[PDB]
Structures are given as C-alpha cells and as structure tokens.
C-alpha cells in the first residue's frame, strides 16, 4: 500500500491513533545526503528529537498490516457507509 | 499577520538578515517585526487585539462568502432570463 | 535637396556630439572582442571630434576616392545611429 | 482633432510611492522547443530572469513560484475535448490523432512538441496565482512573464498560442472585481481574449495592434461588442513603423480617457515583446523606452495591476525590455550596462540595455491617428 | 500559536522542501563552478599549445 | 546567482507557509459556520 | 556555414549502456527486434 | 410560467435584505475611517519613540474594535438570511426551468382550468357589472 | 426508502459478481476506509476500479452513486450554429458562463531583406544549441541530488527503491527529452524504464553520461560562438537599414527625366 499518498497515511495514523511517526516526504527522503545532513531539517530530524520521521515504505507496510489485521463486519459498516455517502452534501 | 508568526510587511535580502557566508550558508534568517506590571498590561492589550481581530476577520470573510453565493444566484437568474429571451427572439 | 539633407544632420549634431563624447564601453565587453575595432582601425569612430566636421571630411574622402563607398555607411551609422540615413548617395547627388 | 504629437519627456517616477511586486518564475519554463524553424522561443523568459537577478533588482522586489494550473482550472475557458486532446497528444502518435489535430487547428502552423501540457499548465498557473495574489491585496503588481499567450481560442490553438492564460487571470480577477481594464501592446490583434470577452461589460479589452494582411484578420474600428458588451471593445489599429513619440501621443490620451470614464479596479496589462524594432514578424519600430513608457504611465495611477508577457519572436530585445519594465515597476531606473550572465554573449554587438529603432516607412499619417482617436472617443463616451 | 498538529506537519513538509532546494542549489553551484574551471583550464591548454605550435 | 536564488527560495517558503496558515484558518472558520448553519436549519423542520 | 546537427551518443555506446544495465540488473540481453510504431 | 413568477420574486426579497444591509452599514459608517487612520498611524515607522503612545493607540484600536463587532455580527445574520432565502428562490427557479425544458402533467393542466374559471368569472364581472 | 432498495440490489449484485469472500471483504474494507473520512472519493473510485473494472453498467452505477454561411455581426465576427454552441466545458464556475462569449467567433477578413534572414538563422541555431545545453544542465542538476542520495544509502534498500514519475522534479517531461536525445530517441525507452524502476543503478551512469555530453556540447558551443560573433559583426547594422538596400534604386528612379516631367505634369493636372 505504498502506492497511496502521504495525506492518506497521515489521516489513517491520526484516526486509528497508531504510534508510528509521520513518514518522510520523498523530497525529505532525498534531502538526507552528506551535505544534506547539515540543513536544519535533517539536523533536527535525526537524533534526540521526538519529532523524528521515518521512510514511507515502513509506514506503508505498518498501515497495510494494520488494515489487513483490522477485521470488518458488513452490518456495522455498510449502513454507516451509506449514511456517509448520503450525508457528504451536508 | 503583524501580531502572528507571519510577516505582513515585505521582506527582502536586507530584511532576511541572513549571515554572511564564505565558500552559515543554511543558517536560519533572523527577523524583527515592524514594532512586570506594565509588560503584563502590554501583553494583555496585545492578546486582546489579537483575538478580537481574529473574530473580526472571521466575520468579514463569512459575510463576503455569503455575498459571493448571493451574487452567484443573481447571475444564474440573469443568465436564465437572457437565454430564454434570446431563444424567443430566435423563434421569430 | 543637398541643403535639406545637410540640415537634417546639422540640426541634431549638437546632441550627437554630446552622445558620442559621453559614450563609454562596458568593462566586460572588450574581453569578448565582439567590439569590432575596424572603425577604430580606420579612424571612422567619431570620438574626440565633432560629428559634422568628420562627416564632411569623409564625404570628401569618398568623392576623391580616399575611402571605399562600402565602409561609409557603417562609418556614419555607428556614430549617428540611423538618423543620417538619407545621405548615402551624396557622391551621385553632387555629380548630378 | 484629438491626437497631438508631443516631445518625449524623460522617465520620471514618484519616489514617495511604494509598490509591492511579486515576480513569478518557473525555472522549467524555458525548456520546450516548438521546432527547428519556429519563431516562438520560450528562452526569453529565462534570459530576462537572469538579467533581473544580475542587475540586483531582487533586493527591492518579491519573487515566488506559481503552482501549475490544474486541468479543471485550465478548463475554465477551453472546451473539455480541446484540453483532453492537448494532454493526450504527443509528437510520436499523431498518426492516430490526425483527424483531431485537423479539427483542432494544430500541427501545420502550430505543431505538437513534447512538454506542451507542462508549458501550458505553467503559464496558466502563473496567471491564476498572479490573479489570486492580486485579489488578496498583498502585492500591487503580479508580474507573470511566462504566459500572456492571448491567441488561443476556445476550441482552437491559432497563432502559436495553445492556452490563453490571460482569460483565466481575468476570470480570477473578476471573481472579486466588477470591472478590469485589459491593455494589449502585441502587434497582432488579441483575437483570443477579444473573442472570449466580446459579449460582456465587466471587462475593458483595450488594444493597440496593427491592421493589414495578417493571420488574425480582426481588430477593426467597427467591432465594439454585442449585447451588454457593446462599445466595450476598444481597438486602435495602426500601421508600419510607429515611432516612440507618436505611440506615446496615441497611448496616453486613450488610457487617460479610459481611466477617467471606465474607472477599473485592476489592470491586466499585456507587454508583448513583438512590438519592437528588429522583430522577426512585428512591423513596428518602437524602442524599448517607448515600450516601457506605456507601462510607466499605467503604473503612475496607483491601482493594482497584473503585468503579463506574451508574444515576442526575438530574444535579446524582448528580455531587455522585460527587465527594464520590471525595474521601472520598482520606481528604479536601470543603467544601460548589462551585467555579465550565462547568456551574455547573446546580447548583440552593442552590449547595452537598449533596443534601437530602425528606419521604416512611417505609414501612420497623423490624419489616420486623428480619425481613430475621434472614433475611439465617440465609442468610449457611451460607457 | 502554531501548536496545531496538521499545521505543524505542513510546516515541516515546507521546511523539508526549502532545505532540499537549498541543498540542490549548493550542489548545482559547485558543479557549474567545476564546469567553469575545467573550461578555463582547457582554454589555457589550447592557448599554450597554439603558442608553441606557432 | 547563488545569493539571489537562496533568497528566492526563502521568500517562496515564507509565502507558502503564510498562505497555508491562512488557508487552514479559513477552512476552520468555514467548517464552524457551516456547522452553525446546519444546527440552525435542523431545528426549523 | 551551417553547423551540423548536434550529435547523439554513438550506437556502440548506447548498446554498451543498455547491455551493462540489463546484465547487472538481471534482465536478458538485448533482443534482436525493433519495436517500430 | 413559474420562471416568470420567480423572476418577479427575486428583486423584492433581494432589495429588502439589501436595505437592511444598508441600515447596518449606516449605523457604523462613521468608524471605518477612524479605524483605518488608527491602523495606518500605528504602522508608521516613526511611532515607537514613546511607549505610552503605543499603549494609548492600542487602547484606541481596541475600543474601536469592541464597538465594531456588533455591526459585523448583524451583517453575518442578515447575509445568512439572504443566503437561505435566495437558495429557496433559486431552487424554485431551476425546478421550473427543468420542468419547462424536459418536454420542449394533468395536475398542471387542471390549474389552467382553475384559472380559466377565474378569467371567465372576471371577464363576466364587466358584462354583468 | 426506495433508494435503499436499489443500493442493496447493487451490493448483492457486487457480491454475486465478485464471487470471492476475500476479495469482497477487501472491497468492503476499502469502502469503510472511505466512510471514515480517510479515503478520497477519486482514490476510492480508482481503487474499486480494480474490482469492478469489467462490468460497465455496474461500475457506471457505482460512479453515479458516490464559416461564411453563418450570420455575420459586421465584417469580422460570425454567429456560431446552434449545434456547436453547447460544447463540454466542465471547469466553468457560475461567473465563467456569465462573462465569457459562446456564440460569437472570430474570422479573419481574408517583405524582408537577405540580411535579417541571416541574422534570424543565426539566432535560430544559437537558440537550438542553448536549449539542448540548458535541458541537459537541468537534468544534470536534478540527477546530482539523486546520485548524492544514492551514494549515501545502504545496499539493503538499493534493489527495492523506485523513483516516482518526475524524479522529484517539477516537470515530468524535461528529464525525458535529454534521455531521448542522447540515446537516439528509440532505445531510450529501455533507459527511461530502467531509470523509473531501478534508480540506484541507472542514475549514476546516466548522470555521468549527461555530464560528458554537456561538456562536449559546451565545447561545440564555444567553437561556434566565434563564427556566430563574426557573422553578426557585419550583418546587425545593415539589417536595421531596410530602405538603404534599395536606396540606390530609389534615387536612380526618382531623378529620371521621364519622372521629372511626370511629377510636374501630374501636379499640374491635380491643380487643374
Ligand atoms: Zn504577437
């Protein structure tokens, strides 16, 4: 499920209250070079900082595992899905 | 914006105050804005102005959005009338 | 025709000489050597002298064969912009 | 008689007035080639931007990058099928798109080149973001040199212009303004924007073009508008080799009258570079200072203005006039020296910030100017 | 006061974009400085070679 | 050129962050007033 | 008078590049077909 | 025919609400120039030379704003009424257009017979008098 | 209430068509993820396209659920036929229809010397060379950061790493043009596919090759810059002289004895 976007994964983590740090953006991932390690973002996002970020692949794998693990029951969700579809205009 | 993190005034190379670098190149831009008991009073007035201005901007933006929707409605009606009149004229 | 053609450049020689005097090449164009000194090689540049007193001298040099007819156009143009355009056929007009 | 020739006064700018300008530049704009033998050359935007960087103008101006326009945003004017084909077409599969290309007027005089959608989206995004920042009131001037291609119709791409971002910019300005005055300086008639806004009052599509044997074939004195847009199509057809003094004497009265009567709130000023001496197809003889006096006069009023690029089939002169206009927008006069840049060797043998007029037959007799001014004033008093 | 989670995340993404742009600028500047240097060295080489050949 | 484009990037980042903060505040306000509209228009019926 | 068109990479180098990348990645060698369309 | 009726109905409600809005603008129009002048004087670069002046200018701005909120909230209220009434009117208008355009029915035929009786009754009210 | 009947028939038809408990529960998990304001509508549609791709009507239901003959206004413009006035424009706001014109369309009513042509040819060649060089330089600038990242990343992630379309660049086509040109525009398909799929092993090679090509083309540009400079030395000024080329003909034609008699005879005739 790495084919998705950053917004979907961030909102998934927020909704399910998962304890996984937000994924690093593709540009943020490529930022981390030898000279790229001297920038503010990389020097403040690597060690000793609670705001540390991690790659998109691992977060995608974690979300895929949690999504497949999370079982579903049609009676609980299908009416909720119909209500949300008929409510989006409001 | 003057009372918040953003800078409403335009900032230039002089305003950014970036430190000189010789090939500090990635250094953050130091900035300055336009401007016990007494300092607490000043903070109280600053906070008061802050949230009252937020409320005022909120109200004005909501009013403008409402007027935008009303003008959309009026333009819709005018276009309908013009199109039907042109159709009638086209008939004869 | 000769009188009016000469007057059309005499009336603006006053400002043309000032423009020529105030001309200053940029420091970093001589390195590229695109500034062709052919006018400087033949002295056709108007710097340091009045424009009219050079244009009549060059007209005389053309009429007596001192200067080739081909170079006269550029010799006057690079100093006079293109406001002295009419008097390229000065030799034939004087001959007529 | 209305036209009255006057001597060209020196450039003067108010030092007390302060103007905010938000220059827009997408670094990837100048990397698409129309073809081997095509007059259109997007490199001029990059050379002009390099000039503004080197002149030191960045210390007194704001510059950003405009996000590319989305397909739905770009469809605010053009038809769905047109944009769909423009996206789907590539220089390598036109054999299966021959009928669509024939219908859409593309391929023969306007050919298909890779990155066409990227260029169109960049120009549209520049125009739309300029208009959006104009509405928000943060910047008084929103310079978008990338776009300005006003020859694009609703369903046809004629005159080397595939997308008309000026229409989208005017639309996003009209979302918060009742009346915006549009000024054209391109030699060709602005057929696209004119046709788009020919039946409306909320715009003032003023123009200064040339009438003769051309591709547009429009821009007569007769065309003034239909419906509520009657007498709201100001055209000033001209002829060969209009010089600086007479162009200024034509421009200043007309613009003064428009601002006194029409009273717009924002100006979408086209600044096409093909109205200069030494152009590839443009027949005018206007110098760069003449090309910038119009912009300075428009700026002197003190109202929000959106400057856009547009045509211009030469590179050096267009870049020079664009950087001079950008400097003049800051109440700063640029010196004649062109400081060294990567593309310095382009700028002719003079290497000075100036484009010099050529000797062309000034067919623009004063009688024609008087007649056209009288007609324009007569059709303008009705506003 | 900027404590919002979504606003903070967007600020972090924008700062990452800014820092990558600053890195790319430095890398490109160094590369084209090297390009200018090698061109200048080749120019000197050719000039000296033509001098000696003449 | 390096100084110019560095300042350009910093200006672009500042503009983007200001625009995004304003967008978020406006979206919060819009949702608040939409909620108030819905609450007012739900009691009428 | 007229400059020749800017040259592309010689075929003897494009074949080396494609073969090198195919062999290092694990792909089979270059097929003897031309996907002309 | 309903299109004609909604076209008549539009301007009346629009004008009632706009007159209300004009009244709200009237009751607070004398403080906008004062607020703008105070803001511009505050944003002057030669102003920070006395702290008490900054305090008093901030106090004046706060007082003006405290007086200015009520007009703004009344403006929101009247604009919301505008929006909902106009929404209803546009709903009626575009149902009318859709019905009139879908067919280039007996219920609306009956209304013609009901109105034909009224037209017949009113025409005979002059003959019989 | 009736609308629920057809929706439930749709759901049971989907259950019958899919014919797999695992696929159906995955699809319903996706639907629930949409229902929790997590999945975007377009993302939801494109995801369910995998399941409901082969049924046209079922997928349609789901997508639904979630120029002289004309009259002329003057000489320039003409009136569009009705069969063309309404054409698909899905981006229009409420005001995008009010001001923009639909029925009125434009319709057109219907000399250079040999030195401006040479100057324009010079400019065309200059622009061609500079355009190629600048495209290569931009691609090199992007691949420089790409390779600087590749060389600082562990072998464990080299194999599975993939570069998204765009390579982090704003333009999705600039990087394609240089590769097509350098690799003869035919075999470049494999190179670009490998770059998309295998960045760690293609980006360094392509970056080095592009650097070599940039150096070679800079050498060629330096070589031809002298020729362009020389050919622009002697043509720029005479290009601006439009009438001077025929000035000799004009002078020899305006002073002929026949013209001398004619310019007086015609003036006398006009005066009479
Ligand atoms: Zn043009």
Numbering used by the authors:
A (entry chain J): 104 to 193
B (entry chain M): 216 to 238, 287 to 298, 328 to 384
C (entry chain A): 1153 to 1248
D (entry chain B): 1 to 383
E (entry chain H): 56 to 109
F (entry chain G): 255 to 299
G (entry chain H): 291 to 327
H (entry chain L): 12 to 115, 129 to 153
Q: Can you quote the paper on this entry?
A:
The Rpd3L histone deacetylase (HDAC) complex is an ancient 12-subunit complex conserved in a broad range of eukaryotes that performs localized deacetylation at or near sites of recruitment by DNA-bound factors. Here we describe the cryo-EM structure of this prototypical HDAC complex that is characterized by as many as seven subunits performing scaffolding roles for the tight integration of the only catalytic subunit, Rpd3. Rpd3 is the sole catalytic subunit in the Rpd3L complex.
Cryo-EM data were then acquired, processed, and the resulting map iteratively improved to 3.5 Å resolution. The cryo-EM structure of the Rpd3L complex reveals an overall architecture comprising two giant lobes attached to the stems of a two-stemmed cross-brace scaffold. Lobe I is formed largely by Rpd3, Sin3, and Sap30 and is wedged between the stems of the cross-brace. Lobe II is made up of Rxt3 and a second copy of Rpd3 and Sin3, but unlike Lobe I, engages only one of the stems. Stem I is made up of a heterodimeric, anti-parallel, two-stranded α-helical coiled-coil comprising Sds3 and Dep1. Stem II is comparatively shorter, formed by a heterodimeric, anti-parallel, four-stranded α-helical coiled-coil comprising Rxt2 and Pho23 oriented almost perpendicular to Stem I, completing the brace. Each lobe and stem together appear to form an independent structural unit. Unexpectedly, the Rxt2 polypeptide chain snakes through many nooks and crannies in both lobes, engaging as many as six subunits and serving as a molecular glue while also stitching the two halves of the dimer together. Intriguingly, whereas the active site is readily accessible in Lobe I, the site in Lobe II is completely occluded by a segment of Rxt2. The active site tunnel is blocked near the entrance by Leu80 that mimics the conformation at both the main chain and side chain levels adopted by an Nε-acetyllysine substrate bound to an Rpd3 homologue.
